[PDB]
Amino acid sequence: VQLQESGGGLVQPGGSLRLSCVASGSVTFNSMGWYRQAPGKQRELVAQITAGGDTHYADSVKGRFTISEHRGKNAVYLEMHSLKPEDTAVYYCHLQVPFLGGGYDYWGQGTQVTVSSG
Amino acid sequence: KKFLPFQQFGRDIADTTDAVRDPQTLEILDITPCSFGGVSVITPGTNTSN
Amino acid sequence: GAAAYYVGYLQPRTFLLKYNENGTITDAVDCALDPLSETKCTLKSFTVEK
Ligand SMILES: *[C@@H]1O[C@H](CO)[C@@H](O)[C@H](O)[C@H]1NC(C)=O
Ligand SMILES: *[C@@H]1O[C@H](CO)[C@@H](O)[C@H](O)[C@H]1NC(C)=O
Structure with missing residues (x-):
């Protein structure tokens, strides 16, 4: 069970949205990450923040998608701007539980975001 | 109440579900009996008044 | 070979777990280890009186 993710929806290109990783309890971790996956394409790493604070950004998402973390609500946040039709996908977030030196992330659930004029 | 990531219910006296976690939004809510008494x-004597 | 490991085999038992105020296991008592532990288990307390 552990973590679940919810939020967002369909928005016409040129808008903005906020994706949230709803808190499932206080867990130890070191890297909160975001992929988006669309049918016919592989799961692509689009965003990653660290426990230290390193915000990894892919080349196709720089300057438009941003990460934040809220320790008060324990939750990760992704603010999305200047949407494009290529952004149509289901978005999932992994955690960094340190199993056996590191592994067994928890992106089991995500949110569908479709960017189209209709 | 602070719930570990793998916990669902809670019971203080081991037979009453004190708390519960909502399946949709993973937040913890406590549960209290409504009321009763x-x-x-x-009254004074019915001989005296009503 | 300084890196090493230790192996043990689990057996059925009757523990008595002491959940703290935050729901974290902090102590336990093996009921069938020594008689004092049996008295602790049957009294449902961590300290028995004379
Ligand atoms: C009962 O009523 C009578 C008259 O109706 C009155 O004199 C008497 O004090 C009353 N006694 C009590 C206990 O109410
Ligand atoms: C239990 O949690 C509270 C905060 O909810 C904290 O202040 C306290 O130190 C914790 N107790 C222990 C023993 O960790």
Whole structure:
């Protein structure tokens, strides 16, 4: 069970949205990450923040998608701007539980975001 | 109440579900019995008044 | 070979777990280890009196 993710929806290109990783309890971790996956394409790493604070950004998402973390609500946040039709996908977030030196992330659930004029 | 990531219910006296976690939004809510009590009628003698 | 490991085999038992105020296991008592532990288990307390 552990973590679940919810939020967002369909928005016409040129808008903005906020994706949230709803808190499932206080867990130890070191890297909160975001992929988006669309049918016919592989799961692509689009965003990653660290426990230290390193915000990894892919080349196709720089300057438009941003990460934040809220320790008060324990939750990760992704603010999305200047949407494009290529952004149509289901978005999932992994955690960094340190199993056996590191592994067994928890992106089991995500949110569908479709960017189209209709 | 602070719930570990793998916990669902809670029971203080081991037979009452004190708390519960909502399946849709993973937040923890506590549960309390609604209310109940007895009704007493303070009265003087019916011979005196009503 | 300084890196090493230790192996043990689990057996059925009757523990008595002491959940703290935050729901984290902090102590336990093996009921069938020594008689004092049996008295602790049957009294449902961590300290028995004379
Ligand atoms: C009962 O009523 C009578 C008259 O109706 C009165 O004199 C008497 O004091 C009353 N006694 C009590 C206990 O109410
Ligand atoms: C239990 O949690 C509270 C905060 O909810 C904290 O202040 C306290 O130190 C914790 N107790 C222990 C023993 O960790």
